From Swiss-Prot, chain A:
One Pfam family here: Ribosomal_L32e
GO molecular function: structural constituent of ribosome
Origin: domain of life: Eukaryota
Name of this protein: Large ribosomal subunit protein eL32
PANTHER family the UniProt entry points to: 60S RIBOSOMAL PROTEIN L32 AND DNA-DIRECTED RNA POLYMERASE II, SUBUNIT N (PTHR23413), RIBOSOMAL PROTEIN L32 (PTHR23413:SF1)
Entry's transmembrane regions: none
Curated annotation (Swiss-Prot), chain B:
Taxonomic source organism: Drosophila melanogaster
Protein name per the record: Large ribosomal subunit protein uL4
Family: Belongs to the universal ribosomal protein uL4 family.
Swiss-Prot record, chain C:
Record GO terms (molecular function): RNA binding; structural constituent of ribosome
Record-given protein name: Large ribosomal subunit protein eL18
GO BP term, pick one: cytoplasmic translation
Protein location: Cytoplasm
Primary location: cytoplasm
Cellular component GO terms, alphabetical: cytosolic large ribosomal subunit; cytosolic ribosome
Keywords on record: Cytoplasm, Ribonucleoprotein, Ribosomal protein
Gene that produces this protein: RpL18
PROSITE patterns in the cross-refs: RIBOSOMAL_L18E
Presence of keyword Methyltransferase: no
Stored InterPro entries: Ribosomal_eL18, Ribosomal_eL18/eL18-A/B/_CS, Ribosomal_uL15/eL18, Ribosomal_uL15/eL18_sf
UniProt family annotation: Belongs to the eukaryotic ribosomal protein eL18 family.
Organism: Drosophila melanogaster (Fruit fly)
UniProtKB/Swiss-Prot annotation, chain D:
Protein name listed in UniProt: Large ribosomal subunit protein uL15
GO terms of biological process kind: cytoplasmic translation
Region feature Disordered, mapped onto this chain: 1-37
SUPFAM superfamilies, per database record: Ribosomal proteins L15p and L18e (SSF52080)
Entry keyword set: Ribonucleoprotein, Ribosomal protein
One Gene Ontology molecular-function label: structural constituent of ribosome
Assigned GO CC terms: cytosolic large ribosomal subunit; cytosolic ribosome
HAMAP family xref list: Ribosomal_uL15
Compositional bias segments (type: Basic residues): 1-31
Gene (name only): RpL27A
Similarity annotation: Belongs to the universal ribosomal protein uL15 family.
Length: 132, 147, 187, 149
RNA sequence: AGAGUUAAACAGUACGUGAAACUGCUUAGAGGUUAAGCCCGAUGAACCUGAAUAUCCGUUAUGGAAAAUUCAUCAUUAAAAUUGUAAUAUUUAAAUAAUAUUAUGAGAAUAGUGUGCAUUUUUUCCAUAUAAGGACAUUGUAAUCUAUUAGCAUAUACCAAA
RNA sequence: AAGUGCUGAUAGAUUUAUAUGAUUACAGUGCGUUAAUUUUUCGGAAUUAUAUAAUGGCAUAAUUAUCAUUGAUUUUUGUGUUUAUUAUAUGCACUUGUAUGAUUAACAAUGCGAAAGAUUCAGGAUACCUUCGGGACCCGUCUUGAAACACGGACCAAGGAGUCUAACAUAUGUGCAAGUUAUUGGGAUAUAAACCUAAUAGCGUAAUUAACUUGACUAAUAAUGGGAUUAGUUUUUUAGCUAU
RNA sequence: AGAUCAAGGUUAUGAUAUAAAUGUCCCAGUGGGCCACUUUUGGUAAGCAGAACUGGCGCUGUGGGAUGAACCAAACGUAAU
RNA sequence: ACCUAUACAUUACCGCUAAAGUAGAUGAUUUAUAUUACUUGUGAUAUAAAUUUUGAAACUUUAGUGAGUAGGAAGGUACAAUGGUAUGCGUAGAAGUGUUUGGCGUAAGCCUGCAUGGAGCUGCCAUUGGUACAGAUCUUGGUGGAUAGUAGCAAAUAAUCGA
């Protein structure tokens, strides 16, 4: 529908599956997210052979497909119609995500104006659902 | 901790700062010895500083081209490369290539000895060139007799 | 892989100061323009002197200027000091001169305007002589500060000579056992 | 009172020792609480770095008053910020209307020392003391001192 | 249990928000294995994600309409400005720099009228012609390039060995 | 040792080079002398002299130098000579055209971003479950050593351990400068703010010896007083380059 | 021995410089170690102790003798060949 | 002849270290054309067209390079209140709570959809406090398996039909 942005390549990432925090299997007081286990015995700290691939600066993406969402842009926070005037002339580059304290009164005012401003949103149809 | 509120003065007020911070030529009045402080950079333009007719008679280098061209190349798979980094590489080929090329004639003539078929238009003109090359040596008998 | 990424591969010295000014950056954002068109060594030493702290960008008192302006056969050279050429009294007569300087105190302008030679700043200088032809460069002392003689003690040598941390002067203050004769030993 | 991202221990959690060791770690005092024993086992880091200690240089000055050794010390090299600064300019015309009068007790300076190396002008100067290396050089310079009341 | 009362009872004396560990339930799978776990790359199942734009041998030739017009080869006039001069006034003795008003200068610049003012203009849609309406994604080629293996070799040249 | 001459493949192809700077120069193409030899005869084909430092072949002169020296290796060359050789003697426009800016790209197939609706191609453990191949001790920590037949851990939500001041040192920011400081104070005047401010008084200025004394370069001047290590500027003249 | 003139080649062994050169904080730690080859005391001796000269283990994964902190290959950015 | 390493080599890529380039845009720059000075042919003029922006803390470009506890500095994010700030969203659903909706980072962490819910909340930049927890034979409050039905309720003579 919308023209895809501004020299859209193959977004091809190094390691994709998430990174899950040594011994978070047998403690559900242990969360999901990582903490380099800094203590002198460990079985992953020594970057061993078998465990949950240990992060560093290697795995990142290219320094032009930084932040690049699967539709070419780089995502960007939007609040009201005045910040969509920030996306006046850059409309072929970035996109918008309607901030989730905006009600369905004001989100009527983005989706009918910035459509004609030719920007892309990730989420229209939030509370649309054609009721109040 | 930020500059600039929108400030509105009055005339009796506005003629007290000259008392309250004197001038560039004097100390002030209402405080003892509080001089008007200094700048550390006394012209603070940059665009009209680069105008300039006193700076850009001494500048040297607008290296506008970048000169990057950073690609390596192979010295055998690119036969194109050879002559460029090294002339006389054409010499050693175009010496030995014809020596092989006459030797390609030198073994089909054994087949033209065994069967004697052609020699019609594929190698007949390839061996009749010596009759033309005889004339390249009749000038050695008629045009090289000048010294 | 190999083995050397050894040490130091790390060029320590300062790229830009830990200072968030908008005047001092304006010299940097000017004098980066005037050392990367010319290659003149005189501009780079201006640039590498725009970077030290409050101490070690040395204070520099006016009598040190004068006999350097009496380093004679130079009646036209402009004075460049990256520092603070303040005023000292006991230079009674003051000569005509024109200085480029960072910071000039209010009692220092008042005698050189009484000289009367105009002092100029750096952008004020920058209009005139970017080449540095007939330009002088004066940098003050750095054993100057009295807090910088605490180095480097191992007292047995008579090359000791190095100011211990006193409490305060008088008697019964770091003066019995070790220093003088009779209380154990002379240093 | 700190900007604490700078302060060393708000990135140290979590390392799992926080900054003071993992063998013989931070035990409430190892040292001897204070200065013990400057003669006893902290010997080496008290000579060197602090000789002259422990003992008795001797004169038991019973109840010093810090007035009898007041003597605030001015030097002859200044001497003309003492007078007006432009007032020196009219003394180099030449006009021998001077030696001028330089009180010191009214200034707040007492004994004229002799670092000095004054100009050639005569000066009549009044101090609360003398210094021999100065006063002979003043006496070549056409001026002389007289002791203040 | 119904019937209610209230915006709410998915607020009914732990009477707001109700998690976390336990798990009672139904659907979904599965199974004598490293004891459970994971980690590596696939894996059906299942929902999902990202998908598009004015040419080969052109941002070409050519024909249809519509609206109009400071644009023509358009004239004037109304401006305000900008740039660049000239002058005056604030200057640290003068110049300069700098603002403030004063005028000239050129060209542009809009609002308004005007050969033809829609005559061969201008601005929006419609047309054929050369590879041609796609111009994009995943694919099979074909060759090119730096690395890189496997498989044949055209003629040499060297001692001795005869 | 020489492209000797390919024939078959593998996976991989940076580059928004203005989204703040040759798309240029090497080469290849079709247009404007020539003469015949030769071949095909449809093109092609083949010819020298035009100029070189020539660079080897050979010859001699000549020397530097040499294990050796009948000599041979040579060196500097010098000349003659034929014989080989190569590059220089291609402007003028044009061309999808060679090569050059980490030198990958023509073709073909597969498909309509189809009012809403919605098929197609790749990907996608998001966090399961299903199916197999290798991996694999289960977490703190003292210690040379913990998978420990070493101690602490049943599970979870909330709470918890680098702080306060004290004076110092150093690094560093910010003003100022032989000065600096109100922050004990009053008064101006709206409130715990700030403003303004006077004498002091801290600390430096000028040192000490146990103290009394004395008091910091011969001079109207000197700077670790002289020395060498020196950037930089000035200058002597030199050639020199670009502008000239 | 010092200052100051006079003459002076191309600076005088190889191979490099991943850059050399220094003053503070005396800056956090750490002041218990282990092993193999040779060299080696103590003891009959030991996976014991006691060392000098290296390399390594603690700090270190790793491919290989199934296994094993040191053995022998090699010292660990993410990826295809 | 083959065999396998995170080693060696080459292409991409990430961060880090080193080196190097870029600011007269009231310009620069080609593309054409009118002209011209004409110097054969190189230049200036005029017209027409189009390319030309960044926290110079930027940007381009180049090479090399990457283990790590004890420990030191480097920028990065949570949870706070205080003054500045965004004509900041908020009963037309604000804070946390779940999640088989979707996504960005190397990573901590956000952004987003739906479902509760009922009255307040965050982003840039200055500051800053009792600031992020798996641990302390840690404190307190729920709650497991064993068992949520096992352990065992066995001393003192012994209870019984019918209403």
């Amino acid at each position: 529908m919308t023209i895809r942005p501004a020299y859209r390549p193959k977004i091809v990432k190094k390691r994709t599956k998430h990174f899950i925090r040594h011994q978070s299997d047998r403690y559900a007081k242990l969360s999901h997210k990582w903490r380099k286990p800094k203590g002198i015995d460990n079985r992953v700290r020594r970057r061993f052979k078998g465990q949950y691939l240990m992060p560093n600066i290697g795995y990142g993406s290219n320094k032009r497909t930084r932040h690049m969402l699967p539709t070419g842009f780089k995502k960007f926070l939007v609040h009201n119609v005045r910040e969509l005037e920030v996306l006046l002339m850059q409309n072929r580059v970035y996109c918008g995500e309607i901030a989730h304290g905006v009600s369905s009164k004001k989100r009527k005012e983005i989706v009918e104006r910035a459509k004609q401003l030719s920007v892309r949103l990730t989420n229209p149809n939030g509370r649309l659902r054609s009721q109040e | 901790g930020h500059v600039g509120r929108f400030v509105i003065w009055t005339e009796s007020a506005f003629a007290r700062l000259n008392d309250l911070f004197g001038t560039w030529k004097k100390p002030s009045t209402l405080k003892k010895g509080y001089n008007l402080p200094q700048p550390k950079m006394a012209n603070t333009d940059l665009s009209r500083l680069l105008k300039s007719e006193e700076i850009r008679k001494v500048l040297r280098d607008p290296r506008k081209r970048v000169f990057r061209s950073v690609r390596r190349l192979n010295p055998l798979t690119n036969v194109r490369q050879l002559i460029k980094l090294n002339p006389y590489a054409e010499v050693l080929k175009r010496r030995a290539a014809l020596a092989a090329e006459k030797r390609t004639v030198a073994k089909v003539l054994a087949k033209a000895k065994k069967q004697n078929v052609e020699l019609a238009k594929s190698h007949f003109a390839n061996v009749a060139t010596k009759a033309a090359a005889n004339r390249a040596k009749l000038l050695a008998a008629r045009k090289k007799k000048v010294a | 892989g190999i083995d050397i990424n050894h040490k130091y591969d790390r060029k320590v010295r300062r790229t830009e100061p830990k200072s968030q000014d908008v005047y001092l950056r304006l010299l940097v954002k000017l004098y980066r323009f005037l050392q990367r068109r010319t290659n003149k060594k005189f501009n780079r030493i201006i640039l590498k002197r725009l970077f030290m702290s409050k101490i070690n960008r040395p204070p520099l008192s006016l009598q040190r200027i004068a006999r350097f302006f009496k380093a004679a056969n130079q009646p036209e050279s402009t004075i460049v000091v990256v520092g603070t050429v303040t005023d000292d009294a006991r230079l009674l007569v003051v000569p005509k001169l024109t200085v480029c300087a960072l910071h000039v105190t209010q009692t220092a302008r008042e005698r050189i305007l009484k000289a009367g030679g105009e002092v100029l700043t750096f952008d004020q200088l920058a209009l005139r002589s970017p080449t540095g032809k007939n330009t002088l460069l004066l940098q003050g002392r750095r054993t100057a500060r009295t807090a910088c003689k605490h180095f480097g003690k191992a007292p047995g040598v008579p090359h000791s000579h190095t100011r211990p941390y006193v409490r305060s002067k008088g008697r019964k203050f770091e003066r019995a056992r070790g220093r003088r004769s009779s209380c154990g030993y002379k240093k | 009172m700190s900007n604490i991202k700078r302060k060393k221990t708000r990135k140290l959690r979590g390392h799992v020792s926080h900054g003071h060791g993992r063998i013989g770690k931070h035990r409430k005092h190892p040292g001897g609480r204070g200065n013990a024993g400057g003669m006893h086992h902290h010997r080496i880091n008290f000579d060197k770095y602090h000789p002259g200690y422990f003992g008795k240089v001797g004169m038991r000055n019973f109840h010093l008053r810090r007035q009898h050794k007041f003597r605030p010390e001015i030097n002859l090299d200044k001497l003309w910020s003492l007078v007006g600064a432009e007032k020196f300019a009219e003394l180099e015309k030449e006009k021998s209307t001077k030696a001028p009068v330089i009180d010191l007790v009214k200034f707040g300076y007492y004994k004229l020392l002799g670092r000095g190396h004054l100009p050639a002008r005569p000066v009549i100067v009044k101090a609360k003391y003398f210094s021999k290396k100065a006063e002979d050089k003043i006496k070549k310079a056409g001026g002389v001192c007289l002791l203040s009341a």
